[PDB]
Amino acid sequence: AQQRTMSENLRRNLAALEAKISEAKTKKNMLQARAKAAKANAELQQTLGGLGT
Amino acid sequence: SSATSAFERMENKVLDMEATSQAAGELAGFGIENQFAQLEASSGVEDELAALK
Amino acid sequence: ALFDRLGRVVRANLNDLVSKAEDPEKVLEQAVIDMQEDLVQLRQAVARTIAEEK
Amino acid sequence: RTEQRLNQDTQEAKKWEDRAKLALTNGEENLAREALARKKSLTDTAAAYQTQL
């Protein structure tokens, strides 16, 4: 009875981590592109304006 | 003498921390029942399809 | 801003100097020659992709 | 990429739906219930995909 309670606690939190990794991988696809876009846009904003060289 | 006499008492309070963690996780996201309802709803249609053919 | 300006100046002086060394008749001839060699390699690149089609 | 991921999940989910028909035929509820659980797992991921797209 004790083992069964302990195992359930472990069985549940395993599912939570696997779901969490899935959540991270799903975002990581789009975040990488967001970071690339932002820098190029920032470089462009300087170009459009007079700021810097 | 008897590491268990003291150490188990510590384990018995580490257990509380886990129980708190577990309760918070389950409370935050219930998915077993939500998934379960979908399973038994699916089945009734399968009986109708089986009967026809 | 400041270093950014100076680093443009270094590039700019070099850019003028190389353009002086570009003769127009010779540089034009050489570029056409390069393009022809490149075209052959590219045709072979397509051929090796067509190889896996076969 | 998003389109490609969604494509896979919808069709693997269908193969589970086919497997459920077989499981009921054979007479094994456990495989039938597992097939439905696996189908749902991919249904949820597929949904997430379009959003991501």
SS3 track for chain D: CHHHHHHHHHHHHHHHHHHHHHHHHHCCHHHHHHHHHHHHHHHHHHHHHHHHC
D37 vs B39: CB contact, 8 Å cut-off? yes
**What are the structure tokens assigned to B2, written together?**
């008897």
D14 close contact with B: CB closer than 8 A: no
CB A13, CB B25: distance < 8 Å: yes
A12: nearest Cα among D45, D8, C52, B23: B23
Q: What type of residue sits at position A3?
A: Q
Q: What sign has the CA pseudo-torsion C53, D2, D5, D7?
A: negative
Resolution in Å, one decimal, please. 3.9
What lies within 8 Å, CB to CB, of D52 at 6+ separation is A26, A29, A30, D2
DSSP H helical ranges for chain B = 3-28, 32-52
Q: What number of other Cβ atoms are within 10 A of residue D35's Cβ?
A: 23
Q: Is A52 left (phi over 0), alpha (psi -120 to 50) or beta?
A: left
Total residues belonging to chain A: 53
CA distance A22 to A38: 25
A-B C-beta contacts closer than 8 Å: 10
- DSSP per residue over C5-44, as a string? HHHHHHHHHHHHHHHHH--HHHHHHHHHHHHHHHHHHHHH
| Residue B24: closest C-alpha in chain A | A13
B50 vs D24: CB contact, 8 Å cut-off? yes
D24: nearest Cα among B51, C49, C22: B51
Q: What type of residue sits at position C20?
A: K
Residues of B in contact with D32 (CB under 8 A): 43
SS3 call for C49: helix
A11 close contact with B: CB closer than 8 A: no
CA distance D6 to D50: 7
- Looking at chain C, which subunits does it touch, using at least 3 CB pairs closer than 8 Å as the criterion? A
CB D2, CB B28: distance < 8 Å: no
CA distance C25 to A20: 64
- Looking at chain B, which subunits does it touch, using at least 3 CB pairs closer than 8 Å as the criterion? A, D
**What are the structure tokens assigned to B27, written together?**
């409370």
SS3 call for B30: coil
CB B46, CB D24: distance < 8 Å: yes
CA distance D39 to chain B (A): 9
